[model samples]
Target: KHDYTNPPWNAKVPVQRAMQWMPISQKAGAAWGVDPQLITAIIAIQSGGNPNAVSKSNAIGLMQLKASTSGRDVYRRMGWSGEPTTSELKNPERNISMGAAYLNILETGPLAGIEDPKVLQYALVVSYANGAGALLRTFSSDRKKAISKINDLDADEFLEHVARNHPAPQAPRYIYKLEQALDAMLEHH
Candidate 1:
């Protein structure tokens, strides 16, 4: 079993948890034609795998589904009436389950209709941080090369690639936030 009794526990455990729920995330990814890495990266970015993590806006658990959206999309799709509270996201099964379902929606909803994963990822990140219509950009560079181009530079430069290409101003530390999670995913795999 993987140990989470250290730093980065929040980011690390969820990926392991995701592996345990592989059949579900994989099946959901397949249903919507998304690569598992896509699902993994999104979750890593959103919640760092902390099922109990809560942002000030009340985005819940892993995947950080805002109560508003989670209320409508996730809860409603699950055929439940009441919205999943911040408490529900604290549950590992619920977090992974809902995270995968959310991924499926993005896959079938907006992402599947597109050809490029990088563009889709860019849209996903923006739409996630800002709003739905907020992500509609006419231009986006390919992210597949973002990592390779910055590989020779320090970690900070690598992170700048992620930041400079973003559609809007974002929390500066978010660069490290995503980098740490992405690094964990890569190193572990």
Candidate 2:
């Protein structure tokens, strides 16, 4: 049996959440300049599709939205009012919606005239997933922290670690198995 507590392959993660997020992934990929698979993997690694999943570090929900990362300008555009509660992050569809919107906010707002959508998309995924908390710890960023910094996280570097350190001992090389089971679990509807 799989250990209840671990990295990448935890059954609790809805790898198939990618399906609910496929359209969002497409949007995110186009906006930031990356492939859909990259975004899929990042979110998979981030929250494992369990929208209620919170990092011990206080990352809320699927993408583990740290309060600092959730800005007024960003949330406002998404029609979100006030600071999002931990309960809000637990709603899978709602969480990914916010997550996708937050990523878009970071791309155009902080990216500052950068026209490359793919790059912006990739930057958001990398910064949020890789930069958020390698040890699952949240960063201490104030509202003033530059969104520009989000683009600097090395996606490749983080993926390597996620691949190796994933919670699932068998998950790194079992992409097919993991993706398949994940899809089935989430019903991929």
Query: What is each predicted model's overall lDDT from 0 to 1?
Result: 0.54, 0.51
| Residue 76 in model 1: lDDT | 73
Tell me the RMSD of model 2 versus the true structure: 8.5
Q: List, in order, the clash count of every candidate structure.
A: 0, 17
Q: Taking the tens digit of each residue's C-alpha lDDT, what string does model 1 give over 91-134? A: 76566667667655654654345445544454455455554342
Question: Residue-wise lDDT of candidate 2 within 1-189, one digit each (tens)?
Answer: 333224434533356654556676676556545455544555676666555677777777765676556634446776767767677666655566566666666554544443344444434454455442322222124322433333344544333444555454333333433343444445444
Q: After superposition, how far is residue 153 of candidate 2 from its true place, in Å?
A: 14
lDDT for 118 in candidate 2 is 42
Which portions of model 2 miss their true places by more than 4 Å? 1-14, 20-39, 71-73, 78-81, 130-189
Q: Which candidate has the top score in lDDT?
A: 1
Tell me how candidate 1 scores on lDDT. 0.54
